[PDB]
Design a protein around this nucleic acid. Structure first.
Lengths: 208, 194, 190, 181, 114, 217
RNA sequence: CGGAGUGAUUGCCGGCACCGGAUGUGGUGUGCAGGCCUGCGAGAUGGCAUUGAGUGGGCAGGCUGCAAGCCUCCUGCCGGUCGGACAAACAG
RNA sequence: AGCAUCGAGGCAGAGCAGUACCCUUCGGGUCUGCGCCAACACCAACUGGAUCUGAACUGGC
RNA sequence: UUGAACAAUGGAUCCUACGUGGACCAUGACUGGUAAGCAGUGCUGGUGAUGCGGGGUGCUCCGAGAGCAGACUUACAGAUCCCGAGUGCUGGCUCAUACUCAGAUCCCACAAAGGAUGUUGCUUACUAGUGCGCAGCUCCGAAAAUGGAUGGUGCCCAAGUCAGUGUGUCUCCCUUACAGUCUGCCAUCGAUGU
RNA sequence: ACCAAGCGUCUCUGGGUCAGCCCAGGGCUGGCCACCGAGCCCCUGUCUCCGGACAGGGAUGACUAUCGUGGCAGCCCCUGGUGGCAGCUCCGCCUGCCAGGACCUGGAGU
């Protein structure tokens, strides 16, 4: 991991199965409240409507260009991570000092790179697609939309994620064995010193 | 099941308190008695906690639900001699404008404050000075030394029968008071009874 | 209005087993095995028999579209049963007025070829799905006849439709110029 | 249901006895209104426009808020109402399973607002009645009129207080559990 | 070393008292950790609170410590609640700086009443 | 689905979570509609008082009674008594999670210190014993699924070694072995050394099966 | 200080072996035993379970590598602070 | 804040274990059991509302 | 019963220096005109002369009116984030493949006739099916020229829309205007004792 | 003298606990008298293993004993305050030194 990211500490949010704008808004409010957040797996973020509807929405968005010089015009990113960063930017007051401080606390990433794969990632219940969208309703995928408008790196990240998942499975099995024998150690000590629990009327000044 | 009315949570003699601030943060002490309204004499024993005979605001301590049954212990202390005033020439900065309330609520305070004594030259506090920065420093050292030695008398006079009582009561209380109270990430003060 | 309960059932014959879990229906049978991930919906899809088995698809508090999609899922499973028991076989008959449509199955099983459709010098290559066999019938039985047989009605019928849409007529009155390869019957291989 | 924000009143009124009419007729309305103010309002809105007796020339003899006798048994209330639309008036018959008549009326009002964009002051309750389960003609009522209705909770979202609404929820949720936490 | 002990609750300064387009820099809004309802702010009502920031020069430290430090302190009090989601209105002296927003503030358990 | 479920039916024992009678038990005595039920729970400690509850507010317990709609208290209390629903509930996992939570809530300072001192005592043992078991299991994994030296023993140039300071005690350690209780515990846990060797970097043990429970609510 | 428990942890001397390219699993990596696995199990505590000395077999190994002592408990001696002492930034 | 916590998928789903099976295309399905609150003692429990853990006191003897 | 109510520091008698004498806006009260941010009128209030809160922005809309401060409380209107205030609670309805993204508080920033077996409800004629219909949302009708605008983001059991609810009582009904209440000070006009 | 912490007076002000009046809600005697028949209940068989289906029959569905309706009883409860199933209207009353009690907890001025 590069030095500046070795220095990194914060919360890691699994962006998979999340509604894009609700995610963005939760992340934005928390960044303003001063949290550092890294929204990981931005290709697996969900958007609330049909694939074709969102494809046409992105088409009409990218229609907007500065006619005198486009290289100065609205930038329309092909990466899911960068699209998400722009939605979060829009939710933030990025044209102030505290607003740019929040936006620089934002730490969006694609796939799951290393400083964040070494960390416990969470999910926002509000903004979660399963917990929010009715099953009746349709939804799309940000990586699908981004490969539709370009973004040649979907499969490149799919392979890397498969590799990461194999390593994670190895570590998960080792962790299962270690938690087995850690319960073993706990019971071995439960023989020596019985665990005193909160549900006890014995804990008092005439006892103890 | 009875909610009951609201009461003023207040320290009682023999109640385990938790100091909220000062040199001894979060240490558990035993409230001995009240000196002034809202100011209490405590000591988590200098052998148990390391907290000497001390005073505390009712506002910088948590009143836990741990009562020690301090019954039958000699808690008599020369509070004025032990704790000096530290503000010499008590109430003279301007010539007294008169105390011109004549019977009640000025006289009943002025007489009640002319009753108490004054920490005399040894048990009082020493205001600072230079005297070549040392003729005061050394004498202050031995003044402090003899004052501490005079306070140790009463402190042990309380703490020798007070430890013999808490060990007599149940032996884990000494380690209960040796342990310091801290907040961790999963402790929510607005939900913690005491 | 949301019906508390709706269920549609499909009786399963003996000799066929319909496994279902996570709405991924697998069907075994003498003719082979099929799978179908009907996971685009959120219904029950269990199999609930010991002596005489049935595939029941249920919806709790659904709307009429759910009471209809239950039946369409059950119908898909019934067609999978048919495809694994008796198989599907679509017979396509050639129709031409002047130009003999010359059809040729390629080196492998795949790639039906249409030549001389309407005199056109183009050649229509239709590479068939894997899981459906196309065979040109001998003229004794029926001349100008192709048959597509398989275990998946979707695959077989889509190969038939692919051959059809390859041989279509452009720029002419299609009330005249009635040429093309037309599905003459939707049968079973039994 | 819970807190049908509607109180039922049985208001009784007449006109001030003039010397030509020393005993004017007496009318008794049944009003489902938020409070007695709105109740008496509706009573007079009917007194005028059906009897030419005006709030200023009339006289309320009783008001009598009515409380539900046994709110622990479910009833099937059929409400006959009429309401005004953008076009004219339409007659409606709806029915609701509820433990209280005021409950069924609040249910009717919110249902009419939902389905037809009707409003309180644009709905006028014609008679209400309680039906035996053999007299309910709607499907969404006849489906619960069985004795042992039974169903699971499948895509549940586990409502929880704001005190412990996990903003980050480092665990993995599951929409199909029993949902104690 | 001596036991370092934690007798405060962290909060975040969530800006000043404000309407949509104007603000009152005298009354700061603070969101306290794990406090997410208005009922839970009755504990912290009245408590003292300090905002810690770092200067460059060394200012005098604790009262009587006679050692300086780079930390600087702005003390205040939690005066009331703010809304329903567990924010409080606190008043500081001097008024909290502008780069205090989005930063941590310690809320001590004194004056205690329990 | 192949999982077994809990249904909303007349006779269910439900867990009322919201209201003045929060965190109590109740019996579904009728089902108003698909959103509301009518529940009576006054056959329980400080339970509800026979009202109408919302399905978002309730939670379904694993058990159910054989009763008709709107059963009176006279019969409902004797049914919950005969079927022993209170104990059958207190023995569940959710009951113990909720009870540990509520006991942490209502615990005094002396109780919190007693639990903290108990865990500070038991940790001095759990840490050492878990390190021991982990060490021995990883050594077993190395001995089984590793790569042993092709060079035999007593035929490898054994390394340099320091001297014991010329003035030190010997002080042999008896804890250099797995005690038979520890060995039985490991043999019961039946570690998969395949998995223990498949991953090289040490990992932290997760939580434990009943970490958040209080036995015998 | 010292006593018990525990033999875990850290650091170092060797050598051996093993990994890591998404931003090396490298935060310039990891592990290394008088032992472990499987049987018998003297005895001792509870009414067969727990604990537990040794011992058979098999598999390995720095054929006890060195230094410290963390942690829980028990017990102190001399000297020092006890003047931030009723709060003043987690006593820094 | 103690700067403690890294399976994947799923959500209309049993969980877990198996050196069992098929390809139904390599992660899906089947099969065999209920020991995995490792004696008994629960729900086929499981949304972090959790788990783990006391920054621990002045020098030397 | 001093013979209706309410209010009232007021009634009478004068003198005198100026500015103004382009108006405009809003409303079935209208007239001319196809109409107009057109022209001309009526009552009243506003703008001009007027700041402040909200309507993104806006001389005229909605609230309210303005000495300097402190505390509390609210109006209009609001609470996904921007942005203070609930990703409130309780029932519905709606899914919209475009370049008008379905829709999204007055003024106001458009939409019609006509059509739909999309969907939700209701009435009604026929003996469960078949007809007429009627309301809610949705779709078509629906075309302009720099790239662009429910204000942006985006939202889909909504962050759209229709209701209800937040009670001196509420697990979450809270936010705040220069408005209301209390207080201090400044100034003005007075009353009283001097 | 200043800065800060604490305790009070008075004037306001925000948020709470128990109360009191009057009612309500229930519970037990499976209370008593009279009605209800179904949202059903029970016993069989068959098909089946379906969180069941159907055909039979039964008011011994009696004796206490599923549920509801009209009226009349005694005794018990913290279990509540019209977000309830309500008193001599509507409305629960009372708002917290001036319709009268005991307290708790913040803030502003003094």
């Amino acid at each position: 991991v590069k030095p500046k990211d070795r220095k990194w500490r914060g919360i890691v949010v699994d962006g998979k199965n999340h509604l894009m704008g609700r995610l963005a808004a939760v992340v934005a409010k928390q960044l303003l409240r001063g949290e550092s957040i890294c929204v990981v797996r931005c290709e697996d973020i969900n958007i609330s409507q049909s694939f074709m509807r969102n494809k046409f929405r992105l088409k009409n968005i990218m229609r907007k260009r500065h006619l005198t010089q486009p290289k100065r015009g609205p930038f329309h990113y092909r990466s899911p991570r960068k699209m998400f960063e722009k939605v979060v930017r829009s939710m933030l007051p990025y044209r102030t000092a505290h607003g740019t401080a929040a936006f620089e606390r934002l730490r969006v990433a694609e796939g799951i790179p290393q400083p964040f794969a070494k960390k416990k990632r969470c999910i926002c219940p509000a903004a979660h697609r399963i917990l929010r969208l009715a099953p009746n309703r349709k939804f799309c995928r940000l990586g699908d939309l981004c490969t539709d408008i370009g973004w040649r790196h979907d499969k490149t990240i799919k392979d890397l994620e498969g590799k990461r998942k194999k390593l994670a499975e190895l570590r998960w099995k080792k962790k299962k064995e270690l938690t087995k024998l850690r319960r073993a150690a706990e019971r071995l000590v439960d023989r020596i010193i019985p665990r005193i629990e909160y549900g006890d009327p014995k804990i008092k000044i005439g006892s103890l | 099941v009875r909610k009951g009315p609201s009461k003023k949570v207040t320290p009682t003699p023999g109640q385990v308190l938790i100091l909220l601030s000062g040199r001894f943060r979060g240490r558990r002490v035993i409230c001995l008695k009240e000196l002034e309204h809202g100011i209490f004499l405590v000591t988590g024993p200098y052998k148990v906690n390391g907290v000497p005979l001390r005073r505390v605001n009712r506002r910088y301590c948590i009143c836990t639900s741990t009562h020690i049954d301090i019954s039958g212990l000699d808690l008599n202390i020369p509070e004025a001699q032990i704790f000096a005033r530290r503000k010499a020439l008590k109430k003279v900065k301007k010539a007294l404008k008169g105390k011109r309330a004549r019977a009640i609520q000025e006289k009943k305070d002025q007489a009640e404050v002319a009753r108490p004594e004054n920490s005399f030259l040894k048990r009082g506090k020493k205001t600072k000075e230079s005297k070549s920065e040392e003729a005061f420093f050394e004498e202050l050292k031995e003044h402090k030394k003899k004052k501490a030695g005079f306070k140790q008398q009463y402190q042990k006079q309380i703490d020798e029968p007070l430890i013999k009582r808490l060990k007599e009561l149940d032996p884990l209380l000494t380690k209960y008071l040796s342990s310091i109270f801290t907040l961790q990430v999963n402790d929510k003060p607005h939900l913690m009874r005491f | 209005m949301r019906a508390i309960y709706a269920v549609h059932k499909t009786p399963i014959p003996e000799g066929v087993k319909v496994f279902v879990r996570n709405r991924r229906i697998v069907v075994r049978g003498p003719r082979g095995t099929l799978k179908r991930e009907m996971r685009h919906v959120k219904y029950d899809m269990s199999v609930k028999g010991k002596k005489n088995k049935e595939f029941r698809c249920e919806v709790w508090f659904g709307k009429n579209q759910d009471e209809a999609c239950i039946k369409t899922i059950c119908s898909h499973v019934a067609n999978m049963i048919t495809g694994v028991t008796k198989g599907f076989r679509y017979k396509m008959r050639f129709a031409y007025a002047h130009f003999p449509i010359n059809v040729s199955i390629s080196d492998d099983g795949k790639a039906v070829e249409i030549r001389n459709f309407l005199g056109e010098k183009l050649i229509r290559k239709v590479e068939v799905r894997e899981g459906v066999s196309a065979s040109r019938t001998d003229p004794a039985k029926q001349k100008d006849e192709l048959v597509l047989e398989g275990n998946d009605i979707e695959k077989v019928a889509q190969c038939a439709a692919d051959i059809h849409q390859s041989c279509l007529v452009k720029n002419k009155d299609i009330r005249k110029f009635l040429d093309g390869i037309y599905v003459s019957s939707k049968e079973t291989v039994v | 249901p819970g807190f049908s924000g509607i109180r039922h009143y049985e208001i009784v009124g007449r006109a001030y006895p003039t010397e030509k009419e020393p005993s004017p007729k007496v009318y008794k309305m049944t009003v489902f209104a938020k409070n007695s103010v709105v109740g008496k309002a509706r009573f007079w809105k009917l007194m005028r426009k059906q009897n030419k007796v005006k709030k200023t020339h009339g006289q309320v003899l009783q008001i009598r808020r009515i409380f539900e006798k046994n709110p622990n048994t479910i009833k099937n209330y059929s409400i006959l109402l009429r309401y005004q639309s953008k076009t004219g008036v339409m007659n409606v018959s709806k029915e609701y399973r509820d433990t209280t008549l005021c409950g069924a009326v609040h249910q009717m009002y919110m249902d009419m607002a939902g389905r037809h964009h009707a409003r309180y002051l644009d709905i006028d309750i014609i008679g209400t009645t309680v039906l035996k389960p053999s007299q309910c003609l709607r499907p969404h009522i006849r489906q619960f009129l069985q004795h042992k209705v039974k169903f699971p909770l499948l895509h549940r979202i586990t409502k929880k207080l704001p005190q412990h609404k996990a903003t980050f929820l480092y665990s993995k949720p599951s929409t199909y559990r029993s949902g104690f936490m | 070393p001596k036991p370092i002990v934690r007798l405060f609750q962290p909060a975040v300064m969530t800006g000043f008292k404000r309407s949509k387009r104007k603000q009152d820099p005298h009354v700061a809004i603070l969101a306290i950790k794990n406090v997410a309802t208005r009922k839970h702010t009755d504990f912290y009502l009245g408590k003292r609170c300090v905002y810690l920031y770092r200067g460059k020069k060394k200012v005098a430290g604790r009262k009587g410590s006679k050692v300086k430090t780079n930390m600087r302190r702005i003390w205040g009090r939690i005066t009331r609640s703010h809304g329903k989601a567990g924010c409080v209105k606190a008043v500081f002296k001097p008024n909290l700086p502008g780069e205090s927003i989005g930063r941590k503030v310690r809320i001590y358990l004194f004056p205690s009443s329990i | 689905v192949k999982a077994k479920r809990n249904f909303v039916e007349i006779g269910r024992v439900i867990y009322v979570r919201f209201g003045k009678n929060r965190d109590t038990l109740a019996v579904i005595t009728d089902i108003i509609d698909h959103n509301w039920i009518f529940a009576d729970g006054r056959a329980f400690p400080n339970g509800m008082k026979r009202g109408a509850v919302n399905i978002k507010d309730i939670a379904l317990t694993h058990m159910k009674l054989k009763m008709g709609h709107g059963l009176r208290h006279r019969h409902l209390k004797e049914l919950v008594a005969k079927e022993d629903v209170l104990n059958k509930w207190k023995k569940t996992t959710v009951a113990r999670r909720l009870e540990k939570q509520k006991n942490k809530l209502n615990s005094t300072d002396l109780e919190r210190w007693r639990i903290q001192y108990n865990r500070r005592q038991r940790s001095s043992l759990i840490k050492v014993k878990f390190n021991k078991l982990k060490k021995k299991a990883l050594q077993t994994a190395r001995r089984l699924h590793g790569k042993k030296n092709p060079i035999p023993f007593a035929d490898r140039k054994k390394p340099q070694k320091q001297a014991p300071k010329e003035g030190k005690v010997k002080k042999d350690d008896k804890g250099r072995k797995l005690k038979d209780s520890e060995r039985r515990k490991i043999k019961k846990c039946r570690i998969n050394y395949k998995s223990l060797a498949g991953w090289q970097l040490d990992v932290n043990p997760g939580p434990i099966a009943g970490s958040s429970l209080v036995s015998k609510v």
